[model samples]
Target chain A: MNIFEMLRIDEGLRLKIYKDTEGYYTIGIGHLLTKSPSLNAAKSELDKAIGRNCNGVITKDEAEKLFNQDVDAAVRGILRNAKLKPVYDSLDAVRRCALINMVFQMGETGVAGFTNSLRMLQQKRWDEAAVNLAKSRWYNQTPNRAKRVITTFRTGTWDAYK
Target chain B: MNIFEMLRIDEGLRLKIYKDTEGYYTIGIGHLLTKSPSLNAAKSELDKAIGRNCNGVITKDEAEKLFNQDVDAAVRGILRNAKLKPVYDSLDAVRRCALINMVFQMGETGVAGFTNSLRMLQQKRWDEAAVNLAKSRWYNQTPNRAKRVITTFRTGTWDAYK
Candidate 1:
């Protein structure tokens, strides 16, 4: 039996993705996102992991433990990778923070899925990156998020992101 | 007429303040909070007016430009206030960036408004201030933002805020 089979995405999980991001599936007066404790818990866990001391060497178990505490561990994992990238040689710390924050709020896959945009970011082609970042399906889905992240990438300031 | 005569907060502005705090104000969406481009532009101008090289400055032609900018002025102003203040105060450039970023994102009124919290920061009461910072109405309204700011404050690490 494949261990990975146990980790398969169930129909319930697939429906949750649509409910949380795509539509306003409701619980009484509240929307699905508002009712999503799992999602919120995941973000909280990710926040905890973000502050974990990553200086020397932290074990995979330790990291997994930290990651599992949040329901959005899979999502936050994307942020962790973005934060640890070698891009600092090109982008300033503040800019990295702004970009990572955008990734954190939006799923890492959502960002990485933008292959054209990712190429621009890796090349440090900021203006093109900004436009590309704003052109993805995610951008079309969340116009406000796209605008803020693009503005930050363009301006190199937290003002746009904040 | 004194500026105070014209300084009366209008009903619309009051309603905005109310909505920003109470009504369905969701934080972390990024764009909604970033709607005040005029406010940010004003702040950038204020930076130039004071001949300051950091990020906090108000630059708008709206009401009370000079007075509004003074807070940004005073924060950097005080670094040079006394030879001793700059000397004994051992805040590094990045740490200073964090504090100034806090003051900029939150106006002087907002930053200074948290006198109790600031005192705790001065005392290096890390856990206490973190709790206090997370407990404010600001945190209650936007738990994610509160978590981000307090984490940055506590860790003194640039990476934590992202």
Candidate 2:
């Protein structure tokens, strides 16, 4: 299966607006409200997603398609925002995927906030970046996910969450 | 047919990113990009609609689902933000729908910026509101649409565009 499918299985599909673990209003496959700076921004984007005149629920297939688009964007963001593009490009596919996953969860700028961690990655210091990853608020918020990403980054192997 | 079906027939669908008449990157049935404040917000929202992992295309079914959600949000926004809720509630269903359509195109706050028009609406001065609606940037952007909405508000009738 594709990474999009894997993410859908991981994130779970939600067709209605509900508060997420972080208390953000979310709907249709983990589209979080707080990610948007203002309600206007959120509403405008939502309007575009569903159509200008439609007022209905989304199907599982629609949710899956949305998930795919989000994932591709995150990956593109990781590539665009990395200070050391050559360094990022040199990493193995699994490690690259791990970084993209981090970008997905935290947003490109949020992930970039980890200066030391990013520096370690840029320098090809896999073990140091792994250690640095575990020392952040992101790790504290979701240790299991952070561990998997850190392991993948350090070992250059795919480490699916258990 | 439901509004979703009608919208699909009206807006048509475009799976790939392309420029709209106004030269904004748009995709998936009239979703314009310039509505977003930043490229990041646009990309993030687009990702949610199209899926980050997949880059191929969107089905009409997917587009319809998205359209439904968007329309629902816009209508909800109009209801939530209308200062004179009782007055709005007293309007004809067609007038109410026309206002909702305006909100969908211009955003709730954008519509609210028409203080005189909203005041006229609150006072049940249907003719005045209709006149005010035709004297704005929105009217200039889409004269025919503005005319239809103005006529509906003024006559308290459903004025479908020709």
Candidate 3:
């Protein structure tokens, strides 16, 4: 499976909207509801589908499709939002993918908020960037995942996950 | 209308999981999905409901009940998790309700993560907490909401929202 598929498995799939442990509205592969218009759209779409006999729950295939679409958008967002595009382009697939993963978790704007970390990445200061990543609220939220991402950045290999 | 009903209207009801503008899974009165088990439970419940019904779409009453239930839990979470119970109790109803609103959006752990802010609240240093609240990522994400919250904190009044 590709990195996106790996992410999908890691996130797990859920077919219905539910309150997360933190009580945010979420559904279908860990998507958190953060706005109204989009929630309205999803509700409208689901209503239409239910009108045809399909349950409100999304199928695994449908969830995977949404995951893939989101991953694609995240990748594009990285290129569009991050500074130093050439530096990003120069990284290997693993490192690039790791960065994209970070963007997925913390929006392009949020990722960009890591000014010192991005600065280190742009300067080819891999070790510094990894250190910076560890000292972040994101790391505080999920240490193992941060470690894996940091390892990928430090070693330029996907082996850390394995 | 009651506070819960007002909150429900403010959040807007959604019946399906959808990515918010910020790309998080959310549904039914701005609830954000933040965990897996709950998502699974929601899926299972919806599935069971659909199996017996005219489709997966829940009635407005059903959705409203869910919102009130979730909101009730959020209020309980504030009491269970946050420090300074006496201070919380000492606040006027409007101020107390504002804090509950914060807990709903940020989660008990997240709200508690506002260490300095909570400390200020405990010390009855309302102005300081208001400043600290404005200087947070939450504020960066939603300035208008933060301003209203900060105003409530500073004034101990609900008029800011009105």
Candidate 4:
């Protein structure tokens, strides 16, 4: 629940099977099974779960499961970091979601590369943390999502959320 | 369908009535009917519309109607404007939804205050329009929403949306 809804919205959900940006038969948050063969595995699971062939469509709950599965992996990755583990432990759920979300986008290794911003966050310097995030390659690439993440860093609240 | 989904996410949905930041008896989407009397009017409407006593909770479809009602008003206000009517007509459905979403948030007058951005759009200069909107009090006040609006302007697509 912490970041599941936010991630679901961010990642984009598909009920019916569709190809991703790379022309892979990706479904349910872009998970690829060696491509869509992996996707077909999920479809097979859903077919059994729903007791019928969903015909490439997934229920909202099924979509949530996929998102949560990936997000939990991200969370595990965050805790695995020696530098970020304590910083994450020091923050509340809201700020934790913010960090986890960044990690969700870029992976733990990628986010760890932001040494200065990570230090600012560890020091609980909200404005500095936000500014550091706002001024980045990531920001230019995904300004809207970046702004929301930076806002989350600045406010220590779900300011980016509706 | 255009602005309704976007506005609903931004406004925050209510299954049970709650007070707005100003302590108005706001329900559904920050609606106040002369206070809770206003809220109660909506509650009354829901009670009649649903053909049952919902107590204080409302269904999701009912919440949608409230958002749609307000957004439609915003639409009417935009078309009513002599200046924006033409600018609005000049844009595609996606961009039009972007403008209407802004209006839905700030009303026609508040958005009309973005004189430069409006003109940038009118001239079909996408980057300039996005930049102008980015440098505004609205952006400072609501960076996430403003960033989404700016994203819509720059890309002419629903990039900000999930």
User: Can you write out model 1's per-residue Cα lDDT over B91-147, one digit (the tens) per residue?
Assistant: 544445445544434433344434445545667676776775665555665576456
Interface quality of candidate 4 as DockQ: 0.01
lDDT by residue for model 4 over B34-76, one digit each (tens)?
2222444445545754567877687777776766777778889
lDDT of model number 3: 0.63
State which candidate has the highest TM-score: 3
Question: What RMSD does each model have against the real structure?
Answer: 20.1, 16.9, 20.3, 20.6
Which scores higher on TM-score, 1 or 4? 4
| TM-score per model over all chains | 0.29, 0.45, 0.48, 0.43
Q: Predictions ranked by lDDT, top down?
A: 4, 3, 2, 1
Clash count, predicted structure 4:
2
Candidate 1 TM-score, C-alpha based: 0.29
CAPRI accuracy category, model 2? incorrect
**Model 2 spans with C-alpha error above 4 angstroms:** A34-45, A52-56, A82-84, B1-162
lDDT digits (tens) for residues A94-122 of candidate 2: 67767777776766655754655666676
- lDDT of each residue in A2-74, candidate 1, tens digit only: 1111111111122122233433221111112221223332333234344653332234454434333322443
Clashes of 3: 18
Candidates 3 and 4, the one with greater TM-score: 3
Kindly list the per-residue Cα lDDT of model 4 for residues A44-94, writing each as its tens digit.
645754567787787777766766776887789789987578889988888
